[PDB]
């Protein structure tokens, strides 16, 4: 029984590997060689959103691409105004051990979570004029690592208990749970259509889940260390992971395999944040070497370095219109980067 | 700036003032981190996050026992990178689980993030270890071959009126932990080993003294004097 099942699993893995090898007629690197290189991406710190008093682990841009929310050990969840460097709100969290934050697509709600194993949803648009926690989503046995909003009523959270959950804010209970990971899930990225999403865990794997079905569709085992960050290609048919072995990777949901690896011999520190550009040609990627590197997503050529931080880059996000890149570091700073023409 | 952009700037200035006040209030407490095993007895030291607040010599201490999350202390130890110190409670009486404790201490010491966080090591369950040594049924030589050729170093400090065998065992355990600690760090962070009898009321005083030494070292580093 157990022996046969352990074997059947091995033969199924071998069949999956053989299918992936058969479908790999070519590679993305050799296909995208005739395209002109993007050049050297020069980016300057337009704004420095200072005011945090501790190390930042999370940020999220609003749908309007002007408001962003940041989380830090200081105990506050500031809603910045990136255009004018203004603190619209400063939400004091019950637990300062916050490693994640989110901004609702409608902009009415924000979320935070961390070592308290609780996702706190805050109502920004209240008639009382203050920000109060509308719902505390408890039910996870591990620290929350990432939380993303589907709409004003649904939010998907990933925790260090090897499970991801889909919540109902109105009710407060897990609508659907996502099991299958064998390590602490450290990031999640919702698809453009929010019908599917991926999660990167510490077992060096990324799993593509379905929010409605609730079952894992595909798995991607190409990394050698913990996946600290995961993003999604703008078209929704690919995603990029960032692991602790200083290499990013670009997996595809259709070919079911890694297309290209974004690594350099000079960089030995792990990736903490990954986000694509609006067109998807550029791959921003934070690194522990106090620097952020811009990777040409089609050629794996470092097109620039966003070296302006005095500590580890922890969070990083590109605006919805692609007009700016905001990087947060452990030096309690938050810098908005924009190209110069 | 407009009239409604000037008022927003004033609101942001008020928000920044409140943030500065909160930071000033929260900077006056020293944060710690309780680490150990199930049998260590970390809860009964000072006598998911289980915060513990105690004050000694008008200095506020905040000990964060991170229970709940239940595996290697990894991927959440990065948050405790600004803590003053790490209290690593270890049961020195159970030799069977001792090697696991040394491995855990080695993993914590060699962490990439806790490369500047000094560890206040407490050799808990001193009375149980003394009783085990006195009984003689359990010998440390069975689990640790190096104990056979180990002898109490000269110029030691056997302040308690205890048998040499108990002192030799305690010094052997402390030496193992110190040798683990001194293999890396290059003096950036150091380990402070102490012995706890599970009834001692001076654990808070020891933590305060070690934190004072750690803060003195940080002040030295801030002066480019070290």
């Amino acid at each position: 029984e157990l022996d046969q099942l352990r074997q059947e699993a091995e033969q199924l893995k071998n069949q999956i590997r053989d299918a992936r090898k058969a479908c790999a007629d070519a590679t993305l690197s050799q296909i995208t060689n005739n395209i002109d290189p993007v050049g050297r991406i020069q980016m300057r710190t337009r704004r420095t959103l200072r005011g945090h008093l501790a190390k930042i682990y999370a940020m999220h841009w609003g749908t309007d691409s002007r408001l962003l929310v940041s989380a830090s050990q200081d105990g506050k969840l500031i809603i910045w105004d990136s255009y004018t460097t203004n603190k619209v709100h400063a939400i004091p969290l019950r637990s300062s051990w916050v490693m994640t934050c989110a901004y609702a697509p409608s902009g009415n709600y924000v979320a935070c979570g961390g070592l308290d194993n609780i996702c706190s949803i805050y109502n920004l648009k209240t008639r009382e004029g203050n920000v109060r926690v509308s719902r505390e989503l408890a039910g996870h046995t591990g620290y929350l690592s990432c939380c993303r909003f589907l709409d004003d009523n649904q939010i998907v959270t990933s925790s260090g208990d090897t499970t991801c959950a889909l919540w109902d804010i109105e009710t407060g209970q897990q609508t659907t749970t996502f099991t299958g990971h064998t390590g602490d899930v450290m990031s999640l990225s919702l698809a453009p259509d929010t019908r599917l999403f991926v999660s990167g865990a510490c077992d060096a794997s990324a799993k593509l889940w379905d929010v409605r079905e609730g079952m894992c569709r595909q798995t991607f085992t190409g990394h050698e260390s913990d996946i600290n960050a995961i993003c999604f290609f703008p078209n929704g048919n690919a995603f990029a992971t960032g692991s602790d072995d200083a290499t990013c990777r670009l997996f595809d949901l259709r070919a079911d395999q890694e297309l290209m690896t974004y690594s350099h011999d000079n960089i030995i520190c792990g990736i903490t944040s990954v986000s694509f550009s609006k067109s998807g040609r550029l791959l921003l990627a934070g690194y522990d070497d106090f620097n952020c590197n811009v990777w040409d997503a089609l050629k794996a050529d470092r097109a620039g370095v966003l070296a302006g931080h005095d500590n580890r880059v922890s969070c990083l996000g590109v605006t919805d219109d692609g007009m700016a890149v905001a990087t947060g570091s452990w030096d309690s700073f938050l810098k908005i980067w924009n190209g110069s023409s | 700036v407009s009239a409604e952009d000037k008022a927003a700037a004033e609101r942001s200035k008020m928000i920044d003032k409140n943030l500065r006040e909160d930071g000033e209030k929260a900077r006056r407490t020293l944060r710690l981190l309780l680490l150990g095993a199930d049998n260590s007895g970390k809860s009964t030291i000072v006598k998911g996050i289980f915060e513990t607040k105690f004050q000694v010599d008008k200095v506020n201490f905040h000990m964060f026992d991170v229970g709940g999350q239940r595996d290697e202390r990894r991927k959440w130890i990065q948050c405790f990178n600004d803590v003053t110190a790490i209290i690593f409670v270890v049961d020195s009486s159970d030799y069977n689980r001792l090697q696991e404790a040394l491995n855990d201490f080695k993993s914590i010491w060699n962490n990439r993030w806790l490369r500047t966080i000094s560890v206040i090591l407490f050799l808990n369950k001193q009375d149980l270890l003394a009783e085990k040594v006195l009984a003689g049924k359990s010998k440390i030589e069975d689990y640790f071959p190096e104990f056979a050729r180990y002898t109490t170093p000269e110029d030691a400090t056997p302040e308690p009126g205890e048998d040499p065998r108990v002192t030799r065992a305690k010094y052997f355990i402390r030496k193992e932990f110190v040798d683990i600690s001194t293999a890396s760090g290059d003096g950036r962070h150091i380990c402070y080993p102490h012995f706890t009898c599970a009834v001692d009321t001076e654990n808070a005083r020891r933590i305060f003294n070690d934190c004072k030494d750690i803060i003195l070292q940080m002040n030295l580093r801030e002066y480019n004097l070290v």
């Epitope: 009382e128 203050n130 | 009239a3 409604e4 004033e10 609101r11 008020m14």
Partner: single-chain antibody, 231 residues
Framework: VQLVESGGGLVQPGGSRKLSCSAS????????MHWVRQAPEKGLEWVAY????????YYADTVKGRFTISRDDPKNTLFLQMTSLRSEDTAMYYC??????????????WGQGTTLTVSADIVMTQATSSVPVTPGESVSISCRSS???????????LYWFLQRPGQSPQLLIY???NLASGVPDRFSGSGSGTAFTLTISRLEAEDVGVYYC?????????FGAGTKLEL
């Protein structure tokens, strides 16, 4: 959220009086507070403004020196020390709230009002003052500022308020395009920097009232004479 004001009666000319605005149901310490007077059979006129934390205080040119605004945050009350009461101060005083942050709805809740009976400005122009409109049809009000209210920030700072007969004014639109919460979808704002239009898709018995347009762009805060809607 409820603002109740008291302290207004019959005052001899040249005397002094103090108005108190009791605030409850909201974070009074985070809301900038205005005082708005309305003479009988006349339009709204801005009086004073005190911000959160009492950092900046702005008074109208017809009350500067005579009137002073102060806020007791701990006890949630706003006050106006009205001195040298001239016979032009015989008007109902309202206590409007205003929080200012990207996307805020300034002038959201207007207080109930207190009738006090004393025994370089952007001139908004609501040409029409009487409109015979029957329920079911669409009606469009129309203001016109002297200076363009479109700041470089891209926000046209014109607000549209409707007062039902015998009721405190309620904001319908903020920054011209925006619609206030609790406000029906049919009211709409269409704007040009010097021309502003408010349109209601369907007339309602509740809708009939006097509609006032204000500019928040320069400090003196003016309100258009208003356009009474006749059923």
């Amino acid at each position: 959220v409820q603002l109740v004001e008291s302290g207004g009666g019959l005052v001899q000319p040249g005397g002094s009086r103090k108005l108190s605005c009791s605030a409850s149901g909201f974070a009074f310490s985070s809301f900038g507070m205005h005082w708005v007077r309305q003479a009988p059979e006349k339009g709204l006129e801005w009086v004073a403004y005190i911000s959160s934390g009492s950092g900046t205080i702005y008074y109208a040119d017809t009350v500067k020196g005579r009137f002073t605004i102060s806020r007791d945050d701990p006890k949630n009350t706003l006050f106006l020390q009205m001195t040298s009461l001239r016979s032009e101060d015989t008007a109902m005083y309202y206590c409007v709230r205003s929080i200012y942050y990207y996307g805020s709805s300034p002038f959201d809740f207007w207080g109930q009002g207190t009738t006090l009976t004393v025994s370089a400005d952007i001139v908004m122009t609501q040409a029409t003052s009487s409109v015979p409109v029957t329920p079911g049809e669409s009606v469009s009000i129309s203001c016109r500022s002297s200076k363009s209210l479109l700041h470089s920030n891209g926000n046209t700072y014109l607000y549209w308020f409707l007062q039902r007969p015998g009721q405190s004014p309620q904001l319908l639109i903020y920054r011209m395009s925006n619609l206030a919460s609790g406000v029906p979808d049919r009211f709409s704002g269409s704007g040009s920097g010097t021309a502003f239009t408010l349109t209601i898709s369907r007339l309602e018995a509740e809708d009939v009232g006097v509609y006032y347009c204000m500019q928040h762009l320069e400090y003196p805060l003016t309100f258009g004479a208003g356009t009474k809607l006749e059923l």
